[PDB]
């Protein structure tokens, strides 16, 4: 049949099409119910997830092949952004593969390298009967709501399937609940495939002078600010393994869900939104922004500790996160220009990442960009612009503020007299916040925003918070982006293997591990202070965020490679995994000024 | 300066534009899917203010007076409900800045009254920001309306108006501390009280006094020929208070329905005693998540008298009686009445209308009903109101019309695909046939059979179909919700202690058992405090559970007993009507009474 082709439906009526493509007949292919994203039209796991969302108002994170649903360990509901316990159970188990499990498919033979994943939809005697997509592309009998049946096997409590194929392997299935019994373990990976490696080019002298394009604007943009210089040695990069990626991936998907859980948490509960020292007046505002733009939030940044002692989170920048441009284009260009290998660039497609992100966010036809008056912020906000203009918005950059006004009644309006209603700021939310904080011994009903001034003189406040303007990050953004939530995470997902353990008072175990003490709202490593478990200063950096509230998270010190601490960093272009990045820097503490290390992924 | 002129901006940036008329659906003002009121009345800024500075919102109400009467607010992102109190102007109380102040009508502000919103309070006066006063351009920048003068004279604060014949009632804050507050006005029992009434018997209504070649009279008409009651030359009467009184209390009493709703919708332990099948919970859930504003019409049971206003029961799911108080007794009035007082249901058909309009709905909706000449023009009526809306429509008449195709989509007898659909079948019927079957994965519903027979469920259930009313509604419809509304609203004025066991106080008061899932005034015991069975109904749902009411009988006026229906139309009162019967339980077979306000 064609693709699309409805070809029945399964238990609760759940649609089947056929997803045979063909090379004989780019955003259309995501399959959407309302604002939540079910899959790929048509693939195995796009049915997958709708039949568990159509049925049970549940998701399974996002995922590159359908073998790795088995590795997750639980599923988000999304009426509330709460979190349930998934539970794994191999082929061949004493629990019983029940109606409504998951069937997971290891890659390989009928299904080399994606894998498979089915839905069971009644077990009997012998015989268990299932419903999937892309598999089968024919019309199904009229009525029937399954399209195999598999020959069960119960032996003394074992319950064993064996597929209709010769080369394909039934990892297990998977059902929602607390019962861990006869379940099997989280896996966790071999920190040797987590270590980070060095390695050098052949210095051909590809590196001597203009290897940068700068009849590239954006390219000759970067130039402009930091000249013809990526890092100290252009022809040293570092490599990960494939594996590992895989690994951060997987992080990254699974920390972004715990993130919001959390953050729908925060805003559930006045004692702990209460947490983060953001004025009260706001507090409805963060709740409408989260309620009604829970989906819009279009990129961020999570900083991350790698290698054989495992995979750690310091923090997930939400907010505001440059670094865009560098893993995205000038990384490509060095590759382009001296790596003659088989790896790849893990932020080799950051741009596409981004259009596709813009498409199916809500932003206006027309989207002013904001940024401060840095020729250092000109490249991040024109890396941006290009995002925009491929996903086909219309903008203008925006230097500074000079160029905004009111007209006489009161409408923020910009130089050429055109309306601002919807903006991509590269400014970080907590600056807007504190041009409140700035009056804040007076009695306002509301935030305290200009609609008109005599000089005309536009506030990066009087925008933002500017009722009609649509911006971007989502205001909410700023809950995740607070360091304040990570203690939260630690209370909610306790001895998570991603986390560690966060307090606001230097509590007792952190003090038997050491710890680092970091301003909830800070950023670029300022006034970050680390303390090992000998009550030794180990390391500590100025910053003007010296007067915030401290939170306190065990110490894990950056891991060193080739002479240089080696931090990654992945990036989460619409909620999932969009590349990755290394920092180095001679000290433990990554700040502004560390430098971008070229990172190959190797096979 | 003209209609909708933007005339400046309110503290936080909440425009506010001219409401000048002298330069139908295009009035409605919302932010989302949140209604926020009439372009441009002072209410519609008082309530965006609300909205968008703090994220909570205040009920309709007819006018701006209205509002120092209301004692609640409503939180949208959480539908959680947040106390308001009410303070006199010269309350010791101070009018800090965010609060409502409420004009009375009177002066200036003649049948309206007024609301603004105090924006900054000084130490001699107080500034504000209103909507319906002004309609010239404000000053570049200024945040504020007017300046009104405030004398603060041992410890009390005082505000007088610019106008000399205006009634400053006092300003209103959401917050729990209730001194210096005024306690919720009440209603003397003597307005709320039915008077009975009779006609000249010029003999208006002794033979074909109904239309019948209007297709809805007619329709009727197959059903209950020319008659409306026993004797059509007797009417009731109630006073404009009262009906006022009954609107308070139906916009009211929808939002708390609503709250004990998503509360339900919240712990399984609630959900669980209303007996819906598990199966379903997620999809009640994902119900009242997407379609939270899509309920059109539902109707409440009230007992009212001289002892004060109670609610029995929210028949938010199937309702009924619609033509009557909508159609029929308009042509009655219109046939026999003479005096100045109206029918409370007259402008039914243009609210219902008006909702469907705003509603989500799909641009062909199929009307289901079941093969009864009775529900004909009950599901006519409906039709007609939904042309009015622009939406096309066919009635089917049970399942038979029905069928599957090769892929299993289901479509009507014409071939055309269903998919919205406005029904008359009652919820628990398709529960039911869940409950006939297996452990199975999910609603058991079909999308292909042998003989291409299609049943309730098969089409309610079906994911893209588009139901009204949402399957939601099932929670606030069934009765099991009365005991958590006590819960949570323990004395409410309008509310009756109800429990499901006979605890203590029910049995010294006496109550009513009521199958929580039931209706028509089936399975109901009322048993007195003596313990004495008062009357009694047999039923089709004698065997589900069931909750006990504190008796509360309705009242007995001219011969008959006298029950009060209100209709909600978008959440908010959409009319009124009676149901008279010569015993104390009201059925499906008891006659509507001709209805008439008067002031
Ligand atoms: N001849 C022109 C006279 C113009 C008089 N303008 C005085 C304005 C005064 N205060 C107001 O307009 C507020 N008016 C109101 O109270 C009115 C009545 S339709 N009600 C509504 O806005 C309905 C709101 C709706 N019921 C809701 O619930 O939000
Ligand atoms: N718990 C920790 N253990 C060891 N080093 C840490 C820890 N937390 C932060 N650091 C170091 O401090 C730097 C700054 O902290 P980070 O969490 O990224 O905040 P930000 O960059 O926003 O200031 C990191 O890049 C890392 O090198
Ligand atoms: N607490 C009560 N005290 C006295 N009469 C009651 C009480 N509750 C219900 N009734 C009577 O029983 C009838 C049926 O109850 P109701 O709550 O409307 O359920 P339904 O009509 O859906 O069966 C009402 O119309 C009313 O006359
Ligand atoms: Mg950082
Ligand atoms: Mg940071
Ligand atoms: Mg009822
Ligand atoms: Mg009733």
Known sequence: APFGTLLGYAPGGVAIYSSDYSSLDDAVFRSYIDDEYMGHKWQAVEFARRF??????????????????????????????????LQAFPNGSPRAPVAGALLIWDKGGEFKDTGHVAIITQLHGNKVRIAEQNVIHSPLPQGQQWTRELEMVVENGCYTLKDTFDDTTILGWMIQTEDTEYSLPQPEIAGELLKISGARLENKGQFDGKWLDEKDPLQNAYVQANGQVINQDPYHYYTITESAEQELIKATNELHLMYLHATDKVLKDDNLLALFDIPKILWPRLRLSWQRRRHHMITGRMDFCMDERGLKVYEYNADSASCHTEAGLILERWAEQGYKGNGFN?????????????????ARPFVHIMQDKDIEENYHAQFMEQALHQAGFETRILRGLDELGWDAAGQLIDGEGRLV??????????????????????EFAAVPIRTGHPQNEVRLIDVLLRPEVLVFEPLWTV????????????????????????????????????????????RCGSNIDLV???????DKTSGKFAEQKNIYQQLWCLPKVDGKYIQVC????????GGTCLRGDESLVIKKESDIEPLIVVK
């Open 570 to 577: 992945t990036f989460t272009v619409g909620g999932n995994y």
């Open 421 to 442: 209603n919807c903006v991509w700021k590269t400014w970080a939310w907590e600056t807007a916040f504190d041009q409140i904080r700035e009056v804040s011994d007076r």
């Open 532 to 538: 090992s478990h000998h009550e030794e200063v180990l």
């Open 346 to 362: 893990p932020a080799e497609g950051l741009i596409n990442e981004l259009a596709g992100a813009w498409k199916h966010s809500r």
């Open 479 to 522: 809950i995740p982006g607070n360091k304040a939530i990570l203690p939260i995470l630690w209370s909610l997902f306790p001895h998570h293997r991603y986390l560690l353990d966060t307090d606001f008072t230097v509590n007792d175990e952190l003090v038997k591990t050491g710890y680092a003490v970091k301003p909830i709202a800070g």
């Open 52 to 85: 568990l969302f159509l049925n049970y108002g549940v998701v399974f994170t996002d995922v590159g092949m359908a073998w790795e649903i088995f590795s997750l360990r639980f599923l988000r509901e999304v009426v509330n952004d709460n979190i349930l316990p």
